[PDB]
RNA sequence: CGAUGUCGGCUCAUCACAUCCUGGGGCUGAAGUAGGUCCCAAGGGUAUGGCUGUUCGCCAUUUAAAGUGGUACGCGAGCUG
RNA sequence: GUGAAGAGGGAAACAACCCAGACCGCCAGCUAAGGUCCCAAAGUCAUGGUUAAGUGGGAAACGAUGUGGGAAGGCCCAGACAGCCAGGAUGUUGGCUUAGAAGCAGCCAUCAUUUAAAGAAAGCGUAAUAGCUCACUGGUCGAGUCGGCCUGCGCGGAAGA
């Protein structure tokens, strides 16, 4: 049939929200309460790493109310920090813009572990390595 | 290696050739050694798939002609001008 | 539908349906891929 | 083959076995207007059976046919059909009267089908038609004549569709 | 386009086909097109063909092209009563016969080779058919 | 070749569809709008003038549209010259 | 070779093609090319098979899951093939450009896991991502099947006074 409905997902900064372009209209269509979420989100984001873009998934009900689960920041972002870079490489694999030690990846894999399916640390660590190779970020043991 | 079944042929003539080609059979000869040539007619369809592998032209055939066997090699092949049919294959006893 | 003598099949969603002597083509997606004869 | 070598009629319904028709009969609808043509009549306890009429080797094209064609009428007297038939765009009305349904797409003049029996019209809305029907064949045809007032079109989406949205959408331009 | 650079002679006869071949086997190639049927390539047919192949096989494999056109074949011009002189060379035809190998691909899969030749062909004037490399 | 009167016009048409319009559709880069293009469709309809011997063409202004081609490049035992 | 200078019989009619050279006659016979459903003389013949187009009774390039006939190969009861139940995960909303183009505008990346198994991917979709479906993979069913090949006969292609 036709229709539409919610359970939205978005990656908003740690301590910042409400802007129309970034947020607002995005979930506003579903019928979410911008104001409430703005303060609600940034409320817990204070405890979580500030200044780090964390992806949150909002789920609206018929009540138009909503709940959201704050996960861990994207692997790509985490790699940028570890590598100390700002952006990717444009042409990954061809030109490396940064590097990350095998130890760091394990740390990032441990952070993403919650959202990763990886049965063991090796799996999770590699899962991110695939993201690094896609960012043009080399990894030295 | 393949162990081909083929059989005596006995009429020389282009015409008779045309008659053979109306069946799958194409005329063909064994010649070699100290005994006069053996006019056989192998079956195309078998031999088609068998000559498609390199092995044919490379290892020994043993052409079973009515109950006896003669070990030959396929040397030369005068096939149809443009069709995957054969018309002829010369076989030298080696 | 789009009319030519031949243009074969066009994608993997081109089923080729024969209604009469002409050979039409149903397509899931594009109506421009639908042939009357092609 | 497959279907054409598959046999099934429950004991929820009833039959009038005949040598040149396959008749089902019962309540909620009934009566069978598809008939033998190229197929035998055998029977079974739990199946109204038929292999191909002999002296014709192509009769299993007509048989695999005959198969789904019989069983569907049975589904019609046990369960509804033609479940709904929506339409994209609005102010396109309804009527739902004696068996006529009006619908507008800028029709000054009324557009109606005095429907046969064995197919029902209902809606709650001016964007929807909710029909339960019996006899998948019968119904389906008269059902088409409705939505066929105007075809759906891709450049604004509007035009009476089906139940499900199976349109293509092409952007408008020049704005 | 393609012709004798030093001409043996200017003009030549109609010629006849007697069909068949002896030229039936790739010797540079591993895939190829042979003929079915008989005709002429006017060499703008060779040219179109060399082109269509190259755009497809790319800079993988290599191409050879058996038959180079050697019979002129005249056309006597328009609006003059016929039989007053023999015409002038407007062509270089290539008399081709069945089983006569046209072109020759190498270096690329059996399927690529077919669907490069299938693409060339139609800009060829007769029915074709595939060649496999062949042990011989 | 023991005469089959040329072109053009006029007059009178008639046929074919490879359709210009109307009719019915497909696709559309199908917003609408008029269209573009193609398919089906010959029932009916399908322009006057200016110039030029030319048919044609070019130009002017409409028209729903001023189709194309065939009929001894239609028609002189019907007209014109 | 015939016609010329040859009738006759066949090819509808049809100087030349095919068959056959008319001394003459006979409500005589036997054949020939070619024919035997009716016009219109003789098989609604026998046997077997093919074709569905009115092909037969005009045409090619070329296209096709139309059919018949033949052979091999790939997969298959340790359950294939299709659909359906689904897998469709996870890293994953990667970069330039653009707030945001982050598989799929263009350009680059075209890797890898989770596993029993799951392409940074064919297209739709979106400026672009997100999502949907698919060559890609798991389950249900229950028996042959999937593409190529040779080859007989068809189909379209096939529009004019």
- Catalogue all structural domains in chain A, each as residue range(s) with its CATH number: 1-71 (3.30.1550.10), 72-141 (1.10.10.250)
- Helix E44-57 / helix E110-120 crossing angle, nearest 10 deg: 140
Total count of residues recorded for chain B: 94
Give bridge partners of residue E65 from the DSSP assignment.
Answer: E103
Q: What secondary structure, in 3-state letters, does A84-107 show?
A: CCCCCCCCCCCCCCEECCHHHHHH
What is d(CA C37, CA C6) in angstroms, rounded to the nearest whole number? 7
Give bridge partners of residue A8 from the DSSP assignment.
Answer: A58
Please name which of C4, C10, C8, C5 lies closest in space to residue C30, comparing C-alpha atoms. C10
Sequence ranges of the domains in chain B: 1-94
Domain B1-94 has CATH 1.20.1260.10: no
Q: A19: which nucleotide lies closest, measuring CA to C1'?
A: G99
Q: Given a contact as 3+ CB pairs under 8 Å, which chains touch D?
A: A, C
Yes or no: say if A78 and A107 are a contact pair by the CB < 8 Å rule: no
**From which experimental method does this structure derive?**
cryo-EM
The 10 Å Cβ neighbour count of residue E74 is: 17
Yes or no: say if A137 and A86 are a contact pair by the CB < 8 Å rule: no
Yes or no: say if E130 and E114 are a contact pair by the CB < 8 Å rule: yes
The 10 Å Cβ neighbour count of residue C14 is: 20
What is the chain B residue with the closest CA to E33?
Answer: B82
What is d(CA A129, CA A109) in angstroms, rounded to the nearest whole number? 9
E32 to chain B, minimum CA–CA distance in Å?
A: 12
Which residues 6+ apart lie within 8 Å of C35 measured at CB?
C1, C2, C3, C4, C7, C23, C24, C25
What is d(CA E125, CA E45) in angstroms, rounded to the nearest whole number? 8
What is d(CA B85, CA B6) in angstroms, rounded to the nearest whole number? 17
What is d(CA A69, CA A37) in angstroms, rounded to the nearest whole number? 12
Yes or no: say if A72 and A24 are a contact pair by the CB < 8 Å rule: no
Cα separation values, A96 from A92, A119, C14, D43, D110, Å: 7, 30, 44, 77, 70
Q: What secondary structure, in 3-state letters, does C2-17 show?
A: EECCCCCCCCCCECCE
Q: D175: which nucleotide lies closest, measuring CA to C1'?
A: F31
Angle at D24 between CA D22 and CA D27, to 5 degrees: 165
* Chain D residues in contact with A1 (beta carbon < 8 A): 86, 163-165
Cβ within 7 Å of nucleic strand F, residues: C 1-3, 30-32, 34, 36; D 151, 153-156, 168, 170, 172-175
Residues 61-120 of chain E sitting with CB below 7 angstroms of strand G: 118
Give bridge partners of residue E96 from the DSSP assignment.
Answer: E39
Burial of A49 (0-12, 13-18, 19+ CB in 10 A): middle
**The pair of three-digit structure tokens given for residue B28, joined into one six-digit string:** 């063909």
Query: Which E-chain residues 64-123 have CB contacts (< 8 A) with chain B?
Result: 98-99
Q: What secondary structure, in 3-state letters, does D48-113 show?
A: CCCCECCCCCCCCHHHHHHHHHHHHHHHHCCCCCCCECCCECCCCCCCCCCCCCCCCCCCCCCCCC
What is the chain D residue with the closest CA to C30?
Answer: D168
The domains located in chain D, with CATH, are 8-79 (3.90.930.12), 85-161 (3.90.930.12)
Q: Can you give the resolution of this entry in Å?
A: 5.8
What is d(CA B47, CA B72) in angstroms, rounded to the nearest whole number? 14
Query: Which A-chain residues 2-21 have CB contacts (< 8 A) with chain D?
Result: 2
**The pair of three-digit structure tokens given for residue E12, joined into one six-digit string:** 């030549």
Yes or no: say if B13 and B74 are a contact pair by the CB < 8 Å rule: no
What is d(CA D146, CA A11) in angstroms, rounded to the nearest whole number? 47
Q: Following CA atoms C22, C26, C29, C35 in sequence, which dihedral angle do they give, to the nearest 10 degrees?
A: 0
What is d(CA D81, CA D83) in angstroms, rounded to the nearest whole number? 5
B55 to chain E, minimum CA–CA distance in Å?
A: 10
Yes or no: say if D155 and D140 are a contact pair by the CB < 8 Å rule: no
Give bridge partners of residue C35 from the DSSP assignment.
Answer: C2, C25
What is d(CA D127, CA D105) in angstroms, rounded to the nearest whole number? 12
| E135·B77 Cβ contact <8 A | no
**Complete DSSP assignment for A31-92:** T--HHHHHHHHHHHHTTS-TTS-EEEEEEE-TTS-EEEEE----HHHHHHHHHT-SS--SST
Give bridge partners of residue D99 from the DSSP assignment.
Answer: none
Helix (H, G, I), strand (E, B) or coil at B6: strand
**The pair of three-digit structure tokens given for residue A19, joined into one six-digit string:** 């802007």
Yes or no: say if D131 and D151 are a contact pair by the CB < 8 Å rule: no
A133 CB inside 7 Å of strand G: yes
| A1·D88 Cβ contact <8 A | no
Q: Which helix (H) or strand (E) holds B50?
A: helix B44-52
**The pair of three-digit structure tokens given for residue E64, joined into one six-digit string:** 């050879």
For the stretch E83-110, what's the b/e string if a residue is b when 16 or more beta carbons lie within 10 angstroms of its beta carbon? eeeeeeeebbbbbbbbbbbbbbbbebee
Domain E21-136 has CATH 3.40.50.2300: no
C18 CB inside 7 Å of strand G: yes
Chain F bases closer than 7 angstroms to a protein Cβ: 26-32, 38-39
Cα separation values, B16 from B13, B41, B42, D173, E45, Å: 5, 12, 15, 76, 41
Q: Given a contact as 3+ CB pairs under 8 Å, which chains touch A?
A: D
Residue nearest to nucleotide G100 (CA to C1'): A22
Chains C and B touch (3+ CB pairs under 8 A): no
Yes or no: say if E128 and E36 are a contact pair by the CB < 8 Å rule: yes
Q: Rounded to 5 degrees, what are φ and ψ at E133?
A: -60, -60
**The pair of three-digit structure tokens given for residue A139, joined into one six-digit string:** 């990894």
Yes or no: say if E50 and E124 are a contact pair by the CB < 8 Å rule: no
Q: Following CA atoms A51, A93, E109, E118 in sequence, which dihedral angle do they give, to the nearest 10 degrees?
A: 60
Give bridge partners of residue A57 from the DSSP assignment.
Answer: A9, A69
Long-range contacts (CB closer than 8 Å, 24 or more residues apart) made by A37-46: A37/A66, A37/A68, A40/A68, A41/A12, A41/A17, A41/A68, A41/A70, A42/A14, A42/A15, A42/A16, A42/A17, A44/A70, A45/A14, A45/A15, A45/A70, A46/A15
């Amino acid at each position: 049939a036709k229709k539409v409905q919610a359970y939205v997902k978005l990656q908003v900064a740690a301590g910042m929200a409400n802007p129309s372009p970034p947020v607002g209209p995005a979930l506003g269509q579903q019928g979410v309460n911008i104001m409430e979420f703005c303060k609600a989100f940034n409320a817990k984001t204070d405890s979580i790493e500030k200044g780090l873009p964390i992806p949150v998934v909002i789920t609206v009900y018929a009540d138009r109310s909503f709940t959201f689960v704050t996960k861990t920041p994207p692997a790509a972002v985490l790699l940028k920090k570890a590598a100390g870079i700002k952006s990717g490489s444009g042409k990954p694999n061809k030109d490396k813009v940064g590097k990350i030690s095998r130890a760091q990846l394990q740390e990032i894999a441990q952070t993403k572990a919650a959202d990763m399916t990886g049965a063991d640390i090796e799996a999770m660590t590699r899962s991110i390595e695939g993201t690094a190779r896609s960012m043009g970020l080399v990894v030295e043991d | 290696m393949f162990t081909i079944n083929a059989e005596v042929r006995k009429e020389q003539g282009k015409g008779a050739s045309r008659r053979l080609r109306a069946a799958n059979k194409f005329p063909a000869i064994i010649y070699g050694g100290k005994e006069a040539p053996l006019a056989i007619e192998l079956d195309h369809d078998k031999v088609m798939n068998m000559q498609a592998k390199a092995e044919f032209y490379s290892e020994v055939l043993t052409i079973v002609v009515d109950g006896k066997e003669i070990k030959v090699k396929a040397q030369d092949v005068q096939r149809h001008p443009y069709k995957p049919k054969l018309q002829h294959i010369d076989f030298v006893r080696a | 539908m789009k009319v030519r003598a031949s243009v074969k099949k066009l994608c993997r969603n081109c089923k080729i349906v024969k209604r009469d002597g002409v050979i039409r083509v149903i397509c899931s997606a594009e109506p421009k891929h639908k042939q009357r004869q092609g | 083959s497959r279907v054409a070598k598959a046999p099934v009629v429950p004991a929820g319904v009833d039959v009038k076995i005949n040598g040149q028709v396959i008749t089902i009969k019962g309540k909620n609808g009934e009566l069978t207007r598809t008939l033998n043509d190229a197929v035998e009549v055998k029977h079974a306890d739990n199946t109204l059976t038929f292999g191909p009429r002999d002296g014709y080797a192509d009769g299993w094209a007509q048989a695999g046919t005959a198969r789904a064609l019989l069983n569907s009428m049975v589904i019609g007297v046990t369960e509804g059909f033609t479940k709904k038939l929506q339409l994209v765009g609005v102010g396109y009305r309804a009527a739902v009267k004696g068996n006529v349904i009006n619908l507008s797409l800028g029709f000054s003049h009324p557009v109606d089908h005095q429907l046969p029996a064995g197919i029902t019209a209902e809606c709650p809305t001016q964007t929807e038609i909710v029909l339960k029907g019996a006899d998948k064949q019968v119904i389906g045809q008269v059902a088409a004549d409705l939505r066929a007032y105007r075809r759906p079109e891709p450049y604004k989406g509007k035009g009476v569709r089906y139940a499900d949205e199976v349109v293509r959408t092409k952007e408008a331009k020049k704005k | 386009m393609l012709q004798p650079k030093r001409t043996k002679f200017r003009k030549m006869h109609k010629g006849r086909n007697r069909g068949l071949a002896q030229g039936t086997d790739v010797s540079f190639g591993s895939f190829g097109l042979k003929a079915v049927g008989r005709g002429r390539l006017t060499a703008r047919q060779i040219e179109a063909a060399r082109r269509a192949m190259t755009r497809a096989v790319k800079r993988q494999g290599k191409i050879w092209i058996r038959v180079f056109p050697d019979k002129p074949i005249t056309e006597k011009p328009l609006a003059v009563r016929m039989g007053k002189g023999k015409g002038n060379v407007e062509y270089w035809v290539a008399l081709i016969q069945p089983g006569k190998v046209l072109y020759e691909m190498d270096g690329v899969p059996e399927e690529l080779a077919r669907e490069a030749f299938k693409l060339a062909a139609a800009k060829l004037p007769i029915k074709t058919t595939f060649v496999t490399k062949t042990v011989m």
